[PDB]
Amino acid sequence: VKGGGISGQAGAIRHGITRALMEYDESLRSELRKAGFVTRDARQVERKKVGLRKARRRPQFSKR
Amino acid sequence: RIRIRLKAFDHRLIDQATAEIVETAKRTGAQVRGPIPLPTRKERFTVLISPHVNKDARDQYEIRTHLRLVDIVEPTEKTVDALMRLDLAAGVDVQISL
Amino acid sequence: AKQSMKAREVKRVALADKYFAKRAELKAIISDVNASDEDRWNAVLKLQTLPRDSSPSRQRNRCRQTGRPHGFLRKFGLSRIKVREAAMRGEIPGLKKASW
Amino acid sequence: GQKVHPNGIRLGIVKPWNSTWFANTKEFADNLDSDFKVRQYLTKELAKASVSRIVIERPAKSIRVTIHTARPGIVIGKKGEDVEKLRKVVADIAGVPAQINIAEVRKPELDAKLVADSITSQLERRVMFRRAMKRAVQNAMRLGAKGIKVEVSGRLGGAEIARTEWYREGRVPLHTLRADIDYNTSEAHTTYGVIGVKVWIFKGEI
Amino acid sequence: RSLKKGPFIDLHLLKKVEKAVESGDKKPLRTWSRRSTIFPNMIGLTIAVHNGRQHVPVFVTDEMVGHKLGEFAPTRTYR
Amino acid sequence: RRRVIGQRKILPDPKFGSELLAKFVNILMVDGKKSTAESIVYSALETLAQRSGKSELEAFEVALENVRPTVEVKSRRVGGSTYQVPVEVRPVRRNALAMRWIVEAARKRGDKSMALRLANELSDAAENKGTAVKKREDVHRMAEANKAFA
RNA sequence: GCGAAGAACCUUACCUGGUCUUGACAUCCACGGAAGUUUUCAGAGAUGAGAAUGUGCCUUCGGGAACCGUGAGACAGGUGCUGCAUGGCUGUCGUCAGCUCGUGUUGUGAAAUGUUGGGUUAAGUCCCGCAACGAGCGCAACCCUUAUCCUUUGUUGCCAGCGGUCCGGCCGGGAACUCAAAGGAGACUGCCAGUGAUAAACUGGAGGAAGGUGGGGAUGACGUCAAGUCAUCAUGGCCCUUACGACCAGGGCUACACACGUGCUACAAUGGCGCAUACAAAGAGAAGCGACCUCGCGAGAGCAAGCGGACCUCAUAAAGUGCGUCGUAGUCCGGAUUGGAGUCUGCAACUCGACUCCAUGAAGUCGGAAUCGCUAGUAAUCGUGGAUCAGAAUGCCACGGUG
RNA sequence: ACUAUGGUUUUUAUU
């Protein structure tokens, strides 16, 4: 393994182990099919919204 | 190891040299090295949409990097001077390398 | 913007042609102080302030598209208040959208 | 304004543009100043010569233009050399020697800028215009339109309110991303006030 | 202080320092020199320094050298 | 407005062996280092267990079973008057709440490290003890202010 | 923290002495001469005098042209005033689903109707149905993009397979895997079964780049407020024109009689202090970014490699983690307005810039009733860059780490 | 509904 943070390296290794078990046996190509370990997750970052510094915590700026 | 990488700034002006970058290589010699993938820089600019106040919204624009290697594969000076004083496209900059 | 300001906007480089635009490549070699107690060149740096309403710093461009000196984009030759309308019209070399 | 303009984002993506040239950062504003001033010159000389668009190119140490018209004969004029008198002005504005040529545009009553030039006169003269608008629509729908709209704003019925009067056929959608709309704005002046007229044409997607 | 090796010198005042050598009794002269410094080889004549609406007469002592003419002619009436 | 995408469920904790502890390391989460979760497991399992609960299989779970919230109060109208009306606590909140309130008293001791100062107040919850038990006891007293309705 | 990603002069409305009047920038009747190049004097300078030297190559009685300067009358010029005058630009309820027209019916008539009812949806969304029948505008749909596939190309990258090896991507060179583009495909409740007015619509399974608005965005109905803007302009009024125009040399715009809307860092100890360490993008870079190295406590300066950026540099990301240490205290906490002393740039840093080293260690013991933000890569919480430009951002915008 | 209970904001150029 090379590149990126060690908690992402771990996630790429569970994918690699599942793809290697899929090369080993015709029963593993079934028993691992829907386990979710080759099914790429989406925690996809939203387009940065003006005029917020970070994410969704809205600044006060209101009274008057 | 001498390189002559071509850089464009308008994507429609490098769409005029798409064949001539291969014909130049087949006219100067026989090996073709024009094409190359390379990392693209987005070269982004972001701007306000209201001329006054209203800093609540901004819109994004791009120019990107369009790059072709060209390269030199011929040692003969009557061909090296034709590649070092070369023409292919308009609105361009050329990166000479050692 | 006043017509007097629209004229200063060009006059502030039209004589810099003679004094700075072909001389200021030597701003560290000829135009910079080097001697202590006994200068030997020996009063030539005053010739850099001899022309009227004109200096290497006063070469400021302001903005040609609109009457605002601030809010200019030098790499596209436009003001930020007109650059969208011009980039939608396609007038700007190389600058475009898709989209974001 | 409100409701998306065909000269706005609709032209800012995937469409070709009439000026096609480059410039370095040390003189970029005079390159944009000349592009405006040469087209502003030519579009006013040819104001009654059925002109629609003008393209601009900048070859090395030169400038080159093409003028698109539905009447080449009035633009090329006497002896077939009446465009040469235009070079001497645009070469002063650009600072470089100028090249000029023309091109014939087909189906004139299908271009929004030449259709506007068939109806602005009727408002300027203060004459009956509802059949001029029927003709403007029916001639475009005969030539090859898939939709057309025309709308007048100013002095209608001698009122003081911001009221409009129109004629349409085939439906011209503006909120469609791909519809490639041809849109002209026109205005006339009279001893009873100014009168505006807008023309929108649809021919197909992309 | 310094300025770019050795003291700042200001020329439209200096053309009088060159003649007051040979100094004497005269009226205080109007001067627009506000960044000029009070060094012992540039001082010699009576002067009135500009404040942005008037010229005010100013005088210096033997124990001061690290100062500028504008500090003897303040531009504020206060409030 | 009832249209929601949250509404998450829990499963038994892999190291605490219980559904009643399934949220124990996940509450009041801050700055993502998750250093309490790594420092609270096994390293307090024989120093919290001193006098309460029978065997390691309940001697930590007792600190979430011996202390019980039973009632929660909010003002409501009945028959012709307003009262502080209680609602009786269900099994899905019976055990997984009272460990959310000891973080106040655990910040009045001068006691070192988050896991060990928290477990020292949780060690008292196994015998129904605590400093300022307001969020359990002051609502129980208010749920005795009226005891019959309509 | 707005116009403005910068401000000594300049910018600039405000303002004070000097000063020009057909105007710094024009057009109409006229009009002088190489465009250029040096240099002197009064004066703060504007300004006013000059003192000298440039005439191409053609060629017709001639005369060219950049830039300067003139003879009459109209005028020129104006961050002067006026968005209750007009075109353009633009805000928000709201990205809410709503607003209406032609003809028939009813009523004497303003109008009422349809758009209401009945299913259903994010949605006047989709269907059913009536004295209503038909219809436009907006809604949803294109496109941008993400999980995949088809396809092509490869150094300055990456470096396995092949030969040689300063045994090293090092020399030849190539695609293990992967970085890396540049161009196309396609999703339709389509298929299966259940509910429903077998309509519309809703709910599981099969197989998916993505299901049943897949996720995230763009667009701004009719209008409200006669919404802010002549500080970009256009352009009609009201006014100034030996001036409120244009300038030189300087005050300011960073005043202070005294009040608001927000923000940051601490009032500890999942906190500080010291030492050694894991793993990121993204961006700018020839008066630029500056390596190796020396000098000073340090800003920064010096010698000086690379060079238009997958290359060299800005520039050993920080929190996180280990190993040592300090303790429940106004503290090793906390760092503030003056004080001592340097560095850098420039016409010039007292008033009016930014960085750096020393001394002080104040106030701060959780705020006066009272008030406010956020529901999944969200709350949390710690770093990083850039525009301007001779001279610097506790801002603004963008990108990651951890959740 | 157990929220025991309540007053102003100029006539005058305008929506």
Query: D174, D170, D175: which is closest to D198 by C-alpha?
Result: D174
Any idea which nucleotide's C1' is nearest the CA of B32? G153
Helices and strands in chain F: count of H runs, count of E runs: 5, 2
Q: After which residues is chain A broken (C to N over 2.5 A)?
A: none
- The DSSP letter of residue B34 is -
Residue D122 and residue D136 in contact, taking contact as beta carbons nearer than 8 Å: no
3-state secondary structure of C67: coil
- The DSSP letter of residue C36 is S
Instruction: Kindly give the interhelix angle for B20-28 and B77-84, rounded to the nearest 10 degrees.
Output: 160
Within a domain: C69: yes
Residue F143 and residue F86 in contact, taking contact as beta carbons nearer than 8 Å: yes
Distance from CA of A31 to the nearest CA of B (A): 40
Joined tokens for residue D121: 């006169």
3-state secondary structure of F87: strand
Angstrom distance (rounded) from CA D38 to CA D93: 7
Instruction: Kindly give the interhelix angle for D28-45 and D84-94, rounded to the nearest 10 degrees.
Output: 160
Residues 31-50 of A with CB under 7 A from strand G: 40, 42-48, 50
Helix (H) or strand (E) holding F141: helix F134-142
Torsion sign over Cα B15, B20, B22, B24: negative
Q: What is the 3-state secondary structure (H, E, C) of chain E?
A: CCCCCCCCCCHHHHHHHCCCCCCCCCCCEEECCCCCECCCCCCCCCEEEECCCCEEEECCCCCCCCCEHHHHCCCCCCC
Kindly give the pairing relationship between strand B45-48 and strand D147-153.
unpaired
Helix (H) or strand (E) holding C84: helix C83-89
Joined tokens for residue D25: 């950062």
Angstrom distance (rounded) from CA A55 to CA A47: 9
Torsion sign over Cα A43, A46, A48, A49: negative
Give the count of beta carbons closer than 10 Å to the beta carbon of residue E30: 11
Q: Flag if E5 and C35 touch (Cβ within 8 Å).
A: yes
Within a domain: C74: yes
Q: Flag if B47 and C84 touch (Cβ within 8 Å).
A: yes
Whether A5 sits with its Cβ under 7 A from any strand G atom: the answer reads yes
Helix (H) or strand (E) holding F123: helix F114-125
Burial F110-131 (b: 16+ CB within 10 A, else e): eeeebbbbbbbbbbbbbeeebe
Residue D171 and residue D181 in contact, taking contact as beta carbons nearer than 8 Å: no
Method by which the coordinates were obtained: cryo-EM
Within a domain: C99: no
Angstrom distance (rounded) from CA D78 to CA F95: 100
One-letter amino acid for residue F121 of the chain:
E
Helix (H) or strand (E) holding F78: strand F71-78
Does D12 reach chain C within 8 Å, measured CB to CB? yes
Cα-based distances in Å from F150 to C40, E21, F78, F83? 109, 113, 6, 11
Does D62 reach chain B within 8 Å, measured CB to CB? no
Query: E8, E11, E7: which is closest to E31 by C-alpha?
Result: E11
- The DSSP letter of residue D27 is S
Q: What are phi and psi of D170, to 5 degrees?
A: 80, -10
Residue F101 and residue F124 in contact, taking contact as beta carbons nearer than 8 Å: no
Torsion sign over Cα F108, F112, F116, F120: negative
DSSP per position, D60-99: TT-EEEEEEES-HHHHH-GGG-TTHHHHHHHHHHHSS-EE
A59 CA → G189 C1’, Å: 43
Angstrom distance (rounded) from CA C46 to CA C24: 14
Query: B87, B95, B86, B90: which is closest to B67 by C-alpha?
Result: B95
3-state secondary structure of C24: helix
Which nucleotides of chain G are near protein (any atom < 7 Å from a CB)?
1-7, 9-13, 15-17, 24-25, 37, 43-47, 68, 77-79, 87-92, 136-148, 152-156, 159, 179-183, 210, 214-222, 228-229, 231-233, 245-252, 255-257, 260-263, 269-270, 278-284, 287, 306-311, 319-321, 327-328, 346-352, 372-382, 387-391, 396-403
Any idea which nucleotide's C1' is nearest the CA of C50? G347
**Neighbors of chain F by Cβ distance (3+ pairs < 8 Å):** none
Angstrom distance (rounded) from CA F53 to CA D108: 95
Whether F77 sits with its Cβ under 7 A from any strand H atom: the answer reads yes
**Neighbors of chain E by Cβ distance (3+ pairs < 8 Å):** C
Give the count of beta carbons closer than 10 Å to the beta carbon of residue D9: 16
Which nucleotides of chain H are near protein (any atom < 7 Å from a CB)?
1-3
Kindly give the pairing relationship between strand D51-57 and strand D19-20.
parallel
Whether F82 sits with its Cβ under 7 A from any strand H atom: the answer reads yes
Kindly give the pairing relationship between strand D63-69 and strand D98-104.
parallel
Does E4 reach chain C within 8 Å, measured CB to CB? yes
Q: What is the 3-state secondary structure (H, E, C) of A41-56?
A: CCCCCCCCCCCCCCCC
Cα-based distances in Å from C2 to B83, C5, C8, C60, C66? 52, 5, 10, 17, 12
Long-range contacts of D155-160 (CB under 8 A, 24+ apart): D155/D190, D155/D192, D155/D193, D155/D194, D155/D195, D158/D192
Angstrom distance (rounded) from CA F102 to CA F121: 6
Residue D68 and residue D105 in contact, taking contact as beta carbons nearer than 8 Å: yes
What's the reported resolution, in angstroms, to a tenth?
17.0
Q: Give residue C44's domain range.
A: 1-90
Name the β-bridge partners of D165: D152
DSSP per position, F31-44: SS--HHHHHHSSSS
Whether F81 sits with its Cβ under 7 A from any strand H atom: the answer reads yes
- Please list every residue in chain B whose beta carbon sits closer than 8 Å to the beta carbon of residue A50: 55-58
Query: F92, F98, F94, F141: which is closest to F121 by C-alpha?
Result: F98
- Our count of domains for chain C comes to 1
Whether E30 sits with its Cβ under 7 A from any strand G atom: the answer reads yes
E30 CA → G263 C1’, Å: 50
Q: What are phi and psi of F82, to 5 degrees?
A: -90, 135
For residue D72, give every residue at least 6 positions away whose Cβ sits within 8 Å of its Cβ, in sequence order, or none: D102, D103, D104
Distance from CA of C75 to the nearest CA of E (A): 35
One-letter amino acid for residue F64 of the chain:
L
Within a domain: C66: yes
Helices and strands in chain A: count of H runs, count of E runs: 2, 0
Joined tokens for residue D24: 């370095």
For residue D162, give every residue at least 6 positions away whose Cβ sits within 8 Å of its Cβ, in sequence order, or none: D153
3-state secondary structure of D194: strand
Joined tokens for residue F121: 């107040």
Burial (CB count within 10 angstroms: exposed 0-12, middle 13-18, buried 19+), residue C93 = buried
3-state secondary structure of A19: helix
Q: Flag if D22 and B12 touch (Cβ within 8 Å).
A: no
Angstrom distance (rounded) from CA D86 to CA D77: 12
Burial D65-85 (b: 16+ CB within 10 A, else e): bebbbbbbeebbeeeeeebee
Name the β-bridge partners of B29: none
Give the count of beta carbons closer than 10 Å to the beta carbon of residue A3: 7
- CA angle (F86 as vertex; F82, F91 as ends), nearest 5: 160
Within a domain: C27: yes
> Taking CA atoms, what residue in A is nearest to B55?
A51
- The DSSP letter of residue C96 is B
- Whether omega before A64 lies within 30 degrees of 0, making that bond cis, reads yes
Q: What are phi and psi of E15, to 5 degrees?
A: -60, -15
Residue B3 and residue B97 in contact, taking contact as beta carbons nearer than 8 Å: yes
For residue D92, give every residue at least 6 positions away whose Cβ sits within 8 Å of its Cβ, in sequence order, or none: none
Angstrom distance (rounded) from CA B98 to CA D4: 52
Long-range contacts of B76-85 (CB under 8 A, 24+ apart): B79/B28, B79/B29, B82/B28, B83/B4, B83/B28, B84/B4
Joined tokens for residue D79: 């002896």
What does the radius of gyration of chain C's CA atoms come to, in whole angstroms? 20
One-letter amino acid for residue E8 of the chain:
F
Angstrom distance (rounded) from CA D67 to CA D70: 10
Nearest CB neighbour to D7, from listed C88, C94, C98: C88
Q: In chain D, which among 165-204 make CB contacts under 8 A with chain C?
A: none
